[PDB]
Amino acid sequence: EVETFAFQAEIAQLMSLIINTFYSNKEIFLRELISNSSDALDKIRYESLTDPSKLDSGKELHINLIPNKQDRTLTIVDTGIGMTKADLINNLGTIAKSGTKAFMEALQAGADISMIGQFGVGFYSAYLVAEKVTVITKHNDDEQYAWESSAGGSFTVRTDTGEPMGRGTKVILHLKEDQTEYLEERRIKEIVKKHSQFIGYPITLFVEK
Numbered sequence: 488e489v490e491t492f493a494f495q496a497e498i499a500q501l502m503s504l505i506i507n508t509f510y511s512n513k514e515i516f517l518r519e520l521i522s523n524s525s526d527a528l529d530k531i532r533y534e535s536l537t538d539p540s541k542l543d544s545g546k547e548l549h550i551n552l553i554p555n556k557q558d559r560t561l562t563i564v565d566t567g568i569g570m571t572k573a574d575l576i577n578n579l580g581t582i583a584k585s586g587t588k589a590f591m592e593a594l595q596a597g598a599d600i601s602m603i604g605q606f607g608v609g610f611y612s613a614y615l616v617a618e619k620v621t622v623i624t625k626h627n628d629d630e631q632y633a634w635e636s637s638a639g640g641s642f643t644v645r646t647d648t649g650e651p652m653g654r655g656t657k658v659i660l661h662l663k664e665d666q667t668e669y670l671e672e673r674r675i676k677e678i679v680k681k682h683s684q685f686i687g688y689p690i691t692l693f694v695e696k
């Protein structure tokens with residue numbers, strides 16, 4: 488059973504701007520998602536300092552980068568706090584609405600897309616390189632859910648029946664046909680070494696066989 492929701496008008500405009508604006512420095516998407524993963528690991532680690540049982544779903548705190556040339560997907564996995572159903576449908580957008588509005592005003596005030604993280608909506612930079620994004624997420628207080636959007640103004644949410652994650656978030660980028668350089672090992676290493684050198688968790692790049 489799948490539920491289809493419309494994006495809030497502000498987020499829907501930001502997504503259509505990110506897809507249709509010809510911006511060359513597309514590599515910043517990886518920094519934004521790695522930074523989001525780092526935040527999510529901070530929250531579960533902090534919660535566990537007063538409640539060690541919060542880690543029963545998984546003690547490891549890491550970020551995995553998994554390119555797949557055959558599927559043309561780049562997957563960013565983290566074992567962070569994860570996201571609830573309410574997060575995917577309401578709470579993340581409600582927190583963002585002000586940053587999304589402010590980000591559009593800044594884009595006319597001399598700012599470029601690369602400052603998207605300063606407004607808390609960096610996740611949507613995924614659509615610089617991806618035609619479709621799938622998010623698998625698992626929060627200690629909720630079930631495993633699958634979020635998906637190809638932009639176009641709507642997204643879907645469903646209960647995920649696949650491989651249980653335990654805890655964390657998996658972002659699956661279905662890359663555009665002209666953005667396959669981000670499936671290359673030496674390219675990913677360059678972006679990590681240039682944009683995410685100071686992340687307080689291990690970032691493991693999975694090499695394809």
Ligand SMILES: Cc1noc(-c2ccccc2)c1CO
Pocket residue numbers: 523575579580583607608609610611622634
């Ligand atoms: C802000 C914001 N608004 O929505 C999200 C989000 C992230 C993952 C899946 C679905 C929505 C964010 C995170 O930056």
